Amino acid sequence: STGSATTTPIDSLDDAYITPVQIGTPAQTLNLDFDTGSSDLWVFSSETTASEVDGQTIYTPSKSTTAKLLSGATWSISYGDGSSSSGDVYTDTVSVGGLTVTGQAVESAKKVSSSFTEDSTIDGLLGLAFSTLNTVSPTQQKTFFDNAKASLDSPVFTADLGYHAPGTYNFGFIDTTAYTGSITYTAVSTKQGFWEWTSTGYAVGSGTFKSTSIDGIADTGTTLLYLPATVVSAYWAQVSGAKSSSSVGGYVFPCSATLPSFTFGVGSARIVIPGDYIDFGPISTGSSSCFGGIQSSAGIGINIFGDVALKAAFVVFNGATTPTLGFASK
In order of start, what are the domains of the chain with their CATH numbers?
Answer: 5-174 (2.40.70.10), 175-330 (2.40.70.10)
Residue 86 pairs with which residues in a beta bridge? 76, 111
Residue 21 pairs with which residues in a beta bridge? 30
CB within 8 A of 50, min separation 6: which ones? none
54 belongs to the catalytic site: no
Reported structure resolution in angstroms: 1.8
Q: Method used for this model?
A: X-ray
The 3-class secondary structure across the chain, one letter per residue, is CCEEEEEEECCCCCCCEEEEEEECCCCEEEEEEEECCCCCEEECECCCCHHHCCCCCCECHHHCCCCEEEEEEEEEEECCCCCEEEEEEEEEEEEECCEEEEEEEEEEEEEECHHHHCCCCCCEEEECCCHHHCCCECCCCCCHHHHHHHHCCCCEEEEECCCCCCEEEEECCCCCCCCCCCCEEEECECCCCCCEEEEEEEEECCCCCEEEEEEEEECCCCCCEEECHHHHHHHHCCCCCCEEECCCCEEEEECCCCCCCEEEEECCEEEEECHHHHEEEECCCCCCEEEECEEECCCCCCEEECHHHHCCCEEEEECCCCCEEEEECC
46 belongs to the catalytic site: no
CA distance 42 to 23: 11
Residue from 111, 108, 106 nearest 51 by CA: 111
Catalytic residue among 33, 35, 40, 92: 35
Contact between 3 and 168 (Cβ < 8 Å): no
CA distance 143 to 67: 17
CA distance 98 to 52: 31
Catalytic residue among 45, 86, 108, 199: 199
CA distance 128 to 150: 15
Residue from 10, 40, 44, 16 nearest 30 by CA: 44
Amino acid (one-letter) located at 283: I
Task: Give backbone dihedrals phi and psi of 289, rounded to 5 degrees, phi first.
Answer: -100, 130
Residue from 314, 280, 315 nearest 164 by CA: 280
CA distance 24 to 158: 25
Contact between 172 and 156 (Cβ < 8 Å): yes
CA distance 94 to 105: 9
Contact between 32 and 19 (Cβ < 8 Å): yes
Task: Give backbone dihedrals phi and psi of 160, rounded to 5 degrees, phi first.
Answer: -125, 75
Distances (CA, A) of 20 to 56, 203, 204, 294: 13, 36, 36, 29
CB within 8 A of 235, min separation 6: which ones? 204, 260, 262, 294
Amino acid (one-letter) located at 47: E
Distances (CA, A) of 140 to 115, 129, 155, 266: 26, 13, 21, 33
Query: Degrees (nearest 5) of the Cα angle 3, 303, 44?
Result: 45
Residues in the chain: 330
Residue from 283, 258, 259, 284 nearest 273 by CA: 259
